[PDB]
Amino acid sequence: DGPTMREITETIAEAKKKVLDVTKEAQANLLTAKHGMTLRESFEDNVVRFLNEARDKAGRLAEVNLKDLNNVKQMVMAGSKGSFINIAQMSACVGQQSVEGKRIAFGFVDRTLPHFSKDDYSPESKGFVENSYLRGLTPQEFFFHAMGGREGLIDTAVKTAETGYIQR
Amino acid sequence: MTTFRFCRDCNNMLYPREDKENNRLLFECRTCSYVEEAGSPLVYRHELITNIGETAGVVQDIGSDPTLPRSDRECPKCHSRENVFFQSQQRRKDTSMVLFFVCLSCSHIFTSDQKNKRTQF
Amino acid sequence: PRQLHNTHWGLVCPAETPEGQACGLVKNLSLMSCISVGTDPMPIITFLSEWGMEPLEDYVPHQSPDATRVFVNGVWHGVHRNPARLMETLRTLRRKGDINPEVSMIRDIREKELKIFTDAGRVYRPLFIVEDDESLGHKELKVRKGHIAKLMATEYQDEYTWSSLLNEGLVEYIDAEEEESILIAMQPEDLEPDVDPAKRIRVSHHATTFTHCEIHPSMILGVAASIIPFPDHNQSP
Amino acid sequence: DNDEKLIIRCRVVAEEDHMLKKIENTMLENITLRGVENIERVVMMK
Amino acid sequence: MIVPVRCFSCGKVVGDKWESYLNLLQEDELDEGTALSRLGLKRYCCRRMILTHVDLIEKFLRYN
Amino acid sequence: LEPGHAADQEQAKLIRSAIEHTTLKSVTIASEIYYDPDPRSTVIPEDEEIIQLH
Amino acid sequence: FEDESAPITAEDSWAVISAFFREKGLVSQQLDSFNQFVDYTLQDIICEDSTLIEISFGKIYVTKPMVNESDGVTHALYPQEARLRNLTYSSGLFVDVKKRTYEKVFIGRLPIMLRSKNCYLSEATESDLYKLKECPFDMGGYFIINGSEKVLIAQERSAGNIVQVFKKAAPSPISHVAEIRSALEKGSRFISTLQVKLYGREGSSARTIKATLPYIKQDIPIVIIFRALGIIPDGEILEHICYDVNDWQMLEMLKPCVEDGFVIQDRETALDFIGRRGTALGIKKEKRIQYAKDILQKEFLPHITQLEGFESRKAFFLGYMINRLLLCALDRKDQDDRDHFGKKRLDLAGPLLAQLFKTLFKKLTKDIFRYMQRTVELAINAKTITSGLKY
Ligand SMILES: [Zn+2]
Ligand SMILES: [Zn+2]
Ligand SMILES: [Zn+2]
């Protein structure tokens, strides 16, 4: 729905504002860590909760809005194929990509790609993919989601091999 | 805050020696028989929490670096609003996320650090 | 080594790698990457000392502390006290051909280093050059419509060519290492200063410092992934 | 404790700045103040 | 390699329409869709047949 | 925690600080060696007070 | 009339990309690299060990492509026939040799890459490609070896001539190392590793720095290496390292280094210290001192210079590396990112074929001084090259 989309897009806009305060807050040195956890580790743990909480609300939003005759929903309800995360990412938002448990890292000096300026910890700069699949990814998103994806292709081959040796 | 001395003749480094009699600090050389009286009584310092290097890189041409973000903050000195800004250039795990701004007219450095203990940088 | 690194942007495809053991170690060049063949550094070396470069045997750090270190293939050849002059003229010379196009030159402004590499094996790609100015107001891409026509006249006659684009300084080849010192626009319209509910969200130019712009983002892909329709609507695996 | 700055000042009891910078090193690292070896962080959770 | 004889899906002959389709474009200047509908290929299955043919034989004939 | 005092946030801190390993190092801002020859007064303006207690 | 100065838009990209691809095609990485081999690397392989102990090689010519026949003999080869015949789309190499006294010419077959300048197909037109039975869409960039089409796959390696710093894990007695892999475009492709090591972990007692030179069997205190290079006084030594007189933290880290070389106060001594660690007992002082000089002048940072007057240049570059090691130890700079693609180099046909034909030209030139060390008094093995390539 057009109305669902606007609600999804605000859902997402609010999370980016939460992020923006937590940012300004750490930027002024006002933020506290708590107990053996670094300031920057605190900051990241908080922005990633924010961004995940957004992805999720956005996706609950889309689920609700689809009707019983929605055939994706009809599969999920039966149990035969698909789950919430799939609705969500197709229809509402794909969300934060990650490599080794963390937001996309600065592999250029102080930046994730040359299209950004230095010291950028914002959602977009570190791998939040705001768009759904339907809508399409931007180029930067596209590349961070492939980073993501590659890590599971790798992790998958390592799993399969580790698992088989265990099993024997 | 140690400052380092060398032999006026040899240019090798100088080492501390107590003038047992008169209770004073000398630096001697181990190569010449040169000596000189010590300028301070501090011979050694170890900072466990340091700030040396937060500001490394502020250079005449900082502003021609197209990668740096810019803002419209005003400076304490020039009242100008042409800055570039960065984070701490120490590369610590345990660093703050505070910002360092460089006035591009008057070259004054200042921070967004509301608990500023810092005079210099 | 197996992971997709940020630095492979534009140079290797982010999608094409085999499954299994070779995952991540076999790669494929992006459709527009190229690889340097190597070129001799001696005229650049000679040039630099024509332009002020002071030799190492003269260098006295305590007396010239603000000095930029100049490196060429890996070798410290000396020190320069206005690298900005030197850098504007190096670039001008490579945008005209006098320095070969496949040479790489990086000034690191805060690190007070200027490094140049004329060796083979470096992989690179082209981008549009963005220049203030104009006269007309903002920063603008150096190519303009009249260039494009000359291009399309040539296509249709089947003489203004890719090289004519290098020679006139409209396009320049950039490798990973020089990529670190630039700021690139993703689409030409990030340069100019009620949206469609069905378009994707894009996060605007909060940038007035661009130095270059992508030719097209779909050029990050390699041969194989260039045949998938709408890959930007697919889960990455 | 009242004192505003916390300062420890130590001296030994003939070449004497080596003992000092090793002594310093013992200070800093092999002196258990509180706690139990091997346990690096501890976190409360409810 | 050469126009297929019929629409794979509906059986309509379509192998007697290639010369005409190509005449209709280069000689009478119609856009591909108007041209197809003039040959009476009106279901999307037949349209796909002509529109996406690729006459490889034209290359194959260049060898000796 | 001990059966009584298991929902005292403040008896769990105490517990935390009795266990968590702590060295001089974790509390120490900087160390210095000075030549300060005369152990009954001092070259350091600030510790006049400290010395003044012996 | 549409303004010639008007700014472009997104669609107009495709015009510039088409132009790239009319020029370059899709496989220029292959072509450009073979072309440069042919045109420049080849000849440069010849002018390194040109001369022996006299006999000296000058110019190369590269044939178009041809075959040694079964009977009726030597013949232009097009690629369609080499495929079909299990042939090897090769050309031959002729040098220009000279005898002179002190006490044309075939040398081989080079497999040639399709659509290189040397291959017939690069000048051909579309009709010419059909007569030749080659598809006008084929793009080249591969070789035909015994009838089979063979491609070389680019190989990725690290660059040489780059300083890298690394921390090292926990049980190790060194905590950081800085490393370069010194190398050559001119000389050979001889690869010395310098390492610069900081000993003792974070607050050990006297953390020191020492470096690993080639053939020298002990790590050498860095100030001893500065003295063997002629930079004597602590003061001048530390100014090649710490280019900022108020960084009292770096300089306090180089004090243990000053102690560690305190015993050696002049260059002769310093060389000797080093020479002894590279020679057997019994070797005389002068010969030791010269051993150390030759190691430093030739096998220590040889990407700098391998010739005599070049000691200020090496010193500074050693200094720089130790500055880089310390800046990491001091937690001012991060350990170097071994994954940054810019520090990688990918090796294609040219370079791959020059590692080979250099190696092999140095066999071939060693079979020449055995027509000549057993000559008690134009007699050359061609095939060693031909078949080393093909093999
Ligand atoms: Zn002296
Ligand atoms: Zn100011
Ligand atoms: Zn049909």
From Swiss-Prot, chain B:
GO terms for biological process: maintenance of transcriptional fidelity during transcription elongation by RNA polymerase II; RNA-templated transcription; transcription by RNA polymerase II; transcription elongation by RNA polymerase II; transcription initiation at RNA polymerase II promoter; transcription-coupled nucleotide-excision repair. GO terms for molecular function: DNA-directed RNA polymerase activity; nucleic acid binding; zinc ion binding. Zn(2+) 2 binds at residues 75, 78, 103, 106. Zn(2+) 1 binds at residues 7, 10, 29, 32. Its main location: nucleus. It is found in: Nucleus, Nucleolus. It comes from the Eukaryota. A zinc finger (TFIIS-type) spans 71-111. GO terms for cellular component: nucleolus; nucleus; RNA polymerase II, core complex. A zinc finger (C4-type) spans 7-32. The modification Phosphoserine is found at residue 40. Keywords: DNA damage, DNA repair, DNA-directed RNA polymerase, Metal-binding, Nucleus, Phosphoprotein, Transcription, Zinc, Zinc-finger. It holds the Pfam family Zn_ribbon_RPB9. DNA-dependent RNA polymerase catalyzes the transcription of DNA into RNA using the four ribonucleoside triphosphates as substrates. Component of RNA polymerase II which synthesizes mRNA precursors and many functional non-coding RNAs. Pol II is the central component of the basal RNA polymerase II transcription machinery. It is composed of mobile elements that move relative to each other. RPB9 is part of the upper jaw surrounding the central large cleft and thought to grab the incoming DNA template. Involved in the regulation of transcription elongation.
Curated annotation (Swiss-Prot), chain D:
The tandem 7 residues repeats in the C-terminal domain (CTD) can be highly phosphorylated. The phosphorylation activates Pol II. Phosphorylation occurs mainly at residues 'Ser-2' and 'Ser-5' of the heptapeptide repeat. The phosphorylated form of Pol II appears to carry, on average, one phosphate per repeat. The phosphorylation state is believed to result from the balanced action of site-specific CTD kinases and phosphatases, and a 'CTD code' that specifies the position of Pol II within the transcription cycle has been proposed. It is found in: Nucleus. Belongs to the RNA polymerase beta' chain family. The C-terminal domain (CTD) serves as a platform for assembly of factors that regulate transcription initiation, elongation, termination and mRNA processing. Component of the RNA polymerase II (Pol II) complex consisting of 12 subunits. Interacts with DEF1; the interaction is direct and serves to bridge RPB1 to the Elongin complex in a DNA-damaged dependent manner. Interacts with the Elongin subunit ELA1. Interacts with the Elongin subunit ELC1. Interacts with ASK10. Interacts with ESS1. Interacts with RTT103. Interacts with SHE2. This is DNA-directed RNA polymerase II subunit RPB1.
Curated annotation (Swiss-Prot), chain E:
It comes from the Eukaryota. Zn(2+) binds at residues 7, 10, 45-46. One of its GO terms (biological process) is transcription initiation at RNA polymerase III promoter. Pfam families: RNA_pol_N. The keyword Oxidoreductase does not apply. There is a cross-link at residue 59 (Glycyl lysine isopeptide (Lys-Gly) (interchain with G-Cter in ubiquitin)). One of its GO terms (cellular component) is RNA polymerase III complex. Keywords: DNA-directed RNA polymerase, Isopeptide bond, Metal-binding, Nucleus, Ribosome biogenesis, Transcription, Ubl conjugation, Zinc. GO terms for molecular function: DNA binding; DNA-directed RNA polymerase activity; zinc ion binding. Its main location: nucleus. It is found in: Nucleus, Nucleolus. DNA-dependent RNA polymerases catalyze the transcription of DNA into RNA using the four ribonucleoside triphosphates as substrates. Common component of RNA polymerases I, II and III which synthesize ribosomal RNA precursors, mRNA precursors and many functional non-coding RNAs, and a small RNAs, such as 5S rRNA and tRNAs, respectively. Pol II is the central component of the basal RNA polymerase II transcription machinery. Pols are composed of mobile elements that move relative to each other. In Pol II, RBP10 is part of the core element with the central large cleft. Belongs to the archaeal Rpo10/eukaryotic RPB10 RNA polymerase subunit family. HAMAP family: RNApol_arch_Rpo10 (MF_00250). Present with 5300 molecules/cell in log phase SD medium. This is DNA-directed RNA polymerases I, II, and III subunit RPABC5. It comes from Saccharomyces cerevisiae (strain ATCC 204508 / S288c).
UniProtKB/Swiss-Prot annotation, chain F:
It is found in: Nucleus. Transmembrane segments: none annotated. The tandem 7 residues repeats in the C-terminal domain (CTD) can be highly phosphorylated. The phosphorylation activates Pol II. Phosphorylation occurs mainly at residues 'Ser-2' and 'Ser-5' of the heptapeptide repeat. The phosphorylated form of Pol II appears to carry, on average, one phosphate per repeat. The phosphorylation state is believed to result from the balanced action of site-specific CTD kinases and phosphatases, and a 'CTD code' that specifies the position of Pol II within the transcription cycle has been proposed. DNA-dependent RNA polymerase catalyzes the transcription of DNA into RNA using the four ribonucleoside triphosphates as substrates. Largest and catalytic component of RNA polymerase II which synthesizes mRNA precursors and many functional non-coding RNAs. Forms the polymerase active center together with the second largest subunit. Pol II is the central component of the basal RNA polymerase II transcription machinery. During a transcription cycle, Pol II, general transcription factors and the Mediator complex assemble as the preinitiation complex (PIC) at the promoter. Belongs to the RNA polymerase beta' chain family. This is DNA-directed RNA polymerase II subunit RPB1. The chain holds residues 1120 to 1173 of 1733 of the full protein.
